[PDB]
Symmetry: D2
Subunit: 419 residues, 4 copies
Amino acid sequence: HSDAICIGFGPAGIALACAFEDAREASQPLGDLSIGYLEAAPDTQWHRELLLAGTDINHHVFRDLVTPRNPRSRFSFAMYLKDQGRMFDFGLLGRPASRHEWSDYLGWVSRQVDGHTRFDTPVTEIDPVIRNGRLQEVRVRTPQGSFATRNLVLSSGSAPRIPQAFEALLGPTLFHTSRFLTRLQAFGKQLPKRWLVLGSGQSASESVLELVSRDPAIEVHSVHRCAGFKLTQLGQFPNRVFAPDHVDYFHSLNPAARQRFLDWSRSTNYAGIDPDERQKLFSLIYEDSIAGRTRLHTYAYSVISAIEHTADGYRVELTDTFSQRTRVLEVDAVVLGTGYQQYLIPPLLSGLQPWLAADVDGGLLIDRDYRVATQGACDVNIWVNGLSERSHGISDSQSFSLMALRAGRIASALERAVE
Amino acid sequence: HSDAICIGFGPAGIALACAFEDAREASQPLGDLSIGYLEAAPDTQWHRELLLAGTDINHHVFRDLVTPRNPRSRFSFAMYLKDQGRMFDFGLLGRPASRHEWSDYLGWVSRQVDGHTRFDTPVTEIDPVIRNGRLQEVRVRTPQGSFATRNLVLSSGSAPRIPQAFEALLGPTLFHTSRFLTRLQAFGKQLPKRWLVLGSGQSASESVLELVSRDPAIEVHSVHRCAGFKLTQLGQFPNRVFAPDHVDYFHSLNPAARQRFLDWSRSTNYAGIDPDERQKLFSLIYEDSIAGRTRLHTYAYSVISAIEHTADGYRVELTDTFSQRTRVLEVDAVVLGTGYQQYLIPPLLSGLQPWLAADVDGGLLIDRDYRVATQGACDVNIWVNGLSERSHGISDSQSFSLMALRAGRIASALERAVE
Amino acid sequence: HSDAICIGFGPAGIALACAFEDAREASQPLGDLSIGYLEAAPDTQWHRELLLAGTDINHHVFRDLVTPRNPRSRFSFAMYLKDQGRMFDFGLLGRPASRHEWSDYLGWVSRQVDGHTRFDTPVTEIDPVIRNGRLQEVRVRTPQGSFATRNLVLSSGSAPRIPQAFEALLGPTLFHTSRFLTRLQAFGKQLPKRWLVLGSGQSASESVLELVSRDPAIEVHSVHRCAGFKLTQLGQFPNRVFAPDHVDYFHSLNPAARQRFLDWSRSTNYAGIDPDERQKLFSLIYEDSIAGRTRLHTYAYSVISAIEHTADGYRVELTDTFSQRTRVLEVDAVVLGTGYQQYLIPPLLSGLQPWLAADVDGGLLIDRDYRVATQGACDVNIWVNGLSERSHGISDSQSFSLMALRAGRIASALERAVE
Amino acid sequence: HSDAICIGFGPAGIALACAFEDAREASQPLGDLSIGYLEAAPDTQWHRELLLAGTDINHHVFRDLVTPRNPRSRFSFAMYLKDQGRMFDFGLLGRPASRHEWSDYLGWVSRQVDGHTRFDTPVTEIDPVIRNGRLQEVRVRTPQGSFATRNLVLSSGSAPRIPQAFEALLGPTLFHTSRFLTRLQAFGKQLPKRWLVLGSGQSASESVLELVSRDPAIEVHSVHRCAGFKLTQLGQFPNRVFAPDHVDYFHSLNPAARQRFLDWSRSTNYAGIDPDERQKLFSLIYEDSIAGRTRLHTYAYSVISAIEHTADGYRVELTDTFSQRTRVLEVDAVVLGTGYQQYLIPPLLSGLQPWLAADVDGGLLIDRDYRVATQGACDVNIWVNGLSERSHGISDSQSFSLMALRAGRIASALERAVE
């Protein structure tokens, strides 16, 4: 039993722990609240680096896990650089920090605030506890025991979107971007030559780049539902505008207007790629072409209309959505840069449905402070620590600065809920 | 009587003359064809600078009026720099050439190929000439006489889009971006304080910048149909992709698919601004805010739902398209960055309608080589030297490189048509 | 009587006060030490902006007045941005902060740590206090009274270098860069046309830029002892390398080797200009030249060998140092970007000479911690809070980060000296 | 027998051939002059890429082998891009062309103008031909025969500077940068771990980068006579200023003043590195350090005062020039980035000394048009197609634009000399 349980100790949960630790170290009341963290994965560099993949880190160095909420925090990137002796040299770089550096930073913060974190500890189920015909507690169930609380934070996220056509095919030679590194490693010393990469966002771009980087004979077929990479937005949304203002506006709309907004928003099609990532991919392809190798093939306005696994790889049928013209590609492997599914009700909350209010789609009803609206519940609070189009008008991001700000809103709400 | 008449001696017509002059100077057959040019405006720096406004010139220096068609042309920008003694210093700049420099270049080319151009010579009408019950010639009519030809090129463009709500109001204090400079000059030494600028493209951006640049007390209200300037595309379309490939794809679609493409294309909403222009505007506003002046006000997802001219300026009602919430602004002047109208049939071709084929909207039917399809016509050819969404899938651009390429296609087609 | 007196409340003294305030607010012992600050100039934005002139601020935002010493300080630039509500927009700029912004920051810090500062309070003299035939105290004398201390910090700097040839001429039409703004303002609404600007550093560059910016008919003659602006180093020294490592190396040399080092160092001639300043000046001159105005004239390898004030401005004789060829220029005004004199013994320490050790040139003998070495003194300490070639191997800089680091070394040394 | 012989068919000789071919194709008189080219090396991509090494190609694309002399040449980079179909994509890169691209360009030009070039044809000696007691011809001697001419162009350059201390040591594990690639290849699949790289210019930088790039365990000791790479000039000289103006000024000095100029010039120490090369090296080292590897060690103000080859690599003694402090390094291999020797009289002109005038150092006396001054010679002309400090005030560069301009001056001088 603790005052709260947070599920997930990725950046979002770390950011939240940093708010509590800032408070503890400053002797403020919030620091007394006891919170435990349950993370399914192990405490490893590999896993933290897995978490940053697909994320646009072409942003200012102040937009770290704590500074936008509290620049005096001992977990700021400036404190990280100073501890590592690199403040001056970092400034001379003239570029934003690398993914690898942000990972290291993230391990450096984690290591300092993880005293209440249980790793290798997946949540398998969350069971209700009813007492007077009304929900009073929940029991978070894990392989290493169970935990009880009135206050729950979900900081674990959502799952890969795998269209039905591909589910039977998931394997070593056809996989989602979320397992890109692991899957590539399984090939050992020899990658297959012919690749198809589906999708138009940063995860797709980085996969393409990594494939044409690893082996000079690899050929990549890059399929886009709309225009290709050359017409994507430069920078992911949270790096172009101050997202909380857009989250505010979205909450100020009534549900009918929200749906009109999302229909416009979805057809506007904002999907953005770090401009340095675009540049790396375009420059490398260009250099390749000087020697005659043209190794990236682009198919715009296309969907995969059929696919089968044969003895000689995959036979993939593309259909151009406008012309209806079709063509067939034979490849050795396929990468799905299809992104992640927005849950209506996260699977872990399955058993609590009777005490959860319904939004217009039956899913979770989430307020501006990330709190889940309940019904027939006595003192039980739940927060979902992330963005979504359906609740907030914006796709979920691994933006460190957004996590910092959310952590502030949640940690304060958690304090009020214990008095 | 000449073998051809080109209407317009802006960049597009100059580019075309450069193809003929290249050919003449090289002794090639195309140089013998006699062509005259009729330009409504005078031969002045002011007018040439008026023509470049709103245009993204953040492109490579090779994408000039001739080089993409013929790098050996004596009208290349490299030859311009060498003639002016600035080749070395230009390279040291590390930035793209300025609008002012491209204007000067353009006057420098014009001055060398304008021996067949009649300026201050507007076309008021174009009359048919029928002989055997079929159209054999046209008579281009001007205030300074008339001209006869079987071969006509329209390089004059299209007109400002002025919504009905504003037509009665056009004047010194409410105007289109195409007269921005002229109108601003009329105020002399004192601009009005409160401005409304409607629109989201580069012409809107540059107007805003110029207004907040000219006077530190000016306040600008910037109204956008969708998201504001911070979410526009960086770079206009022809600077992001090789437009002719997209023009090819659009022509390869049948008319039903073209309409499906434009419906998608129009909701995707690509409207782009030179990234240095965005940067100039954002930096200046930011610097202003350090001293407390917040002088640019943004209204997204908004339309003007009512406007009236009172004794104290304009009273403007905005409606947020999603929320339906309204608000009122009082301003002293209004700038319409509404862009330009695509004609279905340009006004100058009014009298030739009976010999012009019809596209799906009754307008001109234009092929991939910019030729207008005719009916019941003997040897008479017409070209429209520009882009449009309806014929080519792309908005009309003042892209110098595109003009160069078009000039090649048209000048060759003109040669074949005289034998 | 206070434990210490610091003379100067420019950035250097502010940085020092920030160390004490950080300590006070954290309850650390250093915060108990009482220190007063005497600043000759008034507490005004004009004066703070006067202090930043000539300074390369093209450096990373962490290199502020406190962060390199203590990122958790409440006076960090991140805390400044957050207080002003500009953290997100600052990141979107993609450029370093402007001089104007750093000034504002500096006023924002000053306002929070100036409770022990007396402004408009010049030090006219510092008198010794001898007791047992040995120096025990000093009496800092001002127009508003006198102050006694064993611990003295000089944070006031040094004076403009005015060669003998110019001293009689100093006036409204011939002046040093340190009074550039004040002097320009005296002209009111009309500047003179013909200017000569002597010097090759950033103060010279910025003067040139400001002159050709203010008036399109102004002509500037820019005279350089060596090569001109196009061959200056990009960035001032402290922005190219971590200066303290170079200060360390210089202290590790014995005096004979130091002189050999400075002779090499002085002939290497490192004088650097913010690359954006060079760019602004070169771009503007280039744009000017498109229209025919060539308004900046450069004379390399030149000295002024004679000058006289006539009724028609100045008659200036230049001599090329290599060729010995001479020429005469007639100008209306002259700007001396000659920099600042390194004192051997600052004038304010005149009366303490008998208790001050001598370096190889008779001047102050300063250790690595900025302490002045004394003789026959009981408990009396003096620090000079700045760099110099003669003591530290580097020219004095207004580098904010260096001030932060020095402040740490001095404030700790001050603490030890009071127990 | 031909009207002229040019020794060397690297960029300089290719540039010269382009002037003749431009003239031939335009029917101008210069095209009739017969000239043959003798190149020692073979016609291979490997060799052309060997020629560009150490060269700052961070310059504008107009500064190619022909354009600064004649933008209409069919050998312009714009014509190259157009022939390869890459003009548009090149512009989208937003960076300067790569070394690899400039090599390809250079092969593309060579292939079009090499019809008078004999490859694998070294000049071993050049013998005089005296007739009336005065020199009338020269006989260029090669392994494949001999050639006679009154007009000689030397476009072969100069030799690696190898200090005496190293001559006996030249081998697979200690080599000059000019054989860096060849030597590295000899190691096959395993490079040695510990490297010393001597020197401060671009060849040194690129060697360092390539070594730390090839193998993550390699350690590099980088020794500099003065300050290290962080204080080098950004950009080589010809990319910072218009070199011909500086060559003009140097020729306008009398010999006594030239020596004073070079003494200043040599102590100013301008040696420049492509800013993107510095950036690549600094970024990679920085990224390495995040994981704990610090693999580049810098020694400023140092010379190698002793070195010996032992059974366990090299034992190298460094002496700091100022402190006189020494230290010893043990490394497995050494790279000499010592640059190239300026000949006083090139070895190939050994036998013509009696007909060659003497400059102040006994060496060649070369005018502003690159002509060698002779004595007692009837109609015999020689040109050295390169820069040098001793004749022109500037170090020899592989600047393509400079070659273009020189080619113009030489080809015209060659024409006058045949009538």
